[PDB]
């Protein structure tokens, strides 16, 4: 509908796959080469389905901060025959607050879904499903189940992936450029 939705669509159309684990179907962001991200509660194993194709997992790393606190991001390297467009230059370098974000989801349950969530707060600490979690972004949109792995964007920045909600607010794990140096 406007330039935020433009940037969100450009990311969804080239840098997402549908990931399936034993814990469900998730929006999965591809970042560069065969490297993607997914919420850690997806419980990635040795095999994952990518657009309904059986795919070996070459590596999976559940990120934690240097206090050994959960960040809810798992970085997955896929045994796929095709690379993602490199979008690392759209990742923020530091923790921040944002205006006018979009949450974008693509699954069997919610295809081509885009949500203007408005202002995004650097919330910080969240007890997420009983697990102390850091680097959480918050938006005042009543997000539901099925949206996990959804991509949070502003114009020109890919800032997080949706990991939870409390019925009135939604929560995303930050994406930082420093997670994807090689």
UniProtKB/Swiss-Prot annotation:
It catalyses: Selective cleavage of Gln-|-Gly bond in the poliovirus polyprotein. In other picornavirus reactions Glu may be substituted for Gln, and Ser or Thr for Gly. Residues 2-180 form the Peptidase C3 domain. The active site is at residues 41, 72, 148. It is found in: Host cytoplasm. Major viral protease that mediates proteolytic processing of the polyprotein. Cleaves host EIF5B, contributing to host translation shutoff. Also cleaves host PABPC1, contributing to host translation shutoff. Binds and inhibits host IFIH1/MDA5, thereby inhibiting the type-I IFN production and the establishment of the antiviral state. Cleaves host MAP3K7/TAK1, resulting in inhibition of TRAF6-triggered NF-kappa-B induction. Cleaves host TICAM1; this interaction allows the virus to disrupt host TLR3 signaling. Cleaves host IRF7, resulting in inhibition of type-I IFN production. Interacts with host IFIH1/MDA5; this interaction inhibits host IFIH1. This is Protease 3C. It comes from Human enterovirus D68. The chain holds residues 1549 to 1729 of 2188 of the full protein.
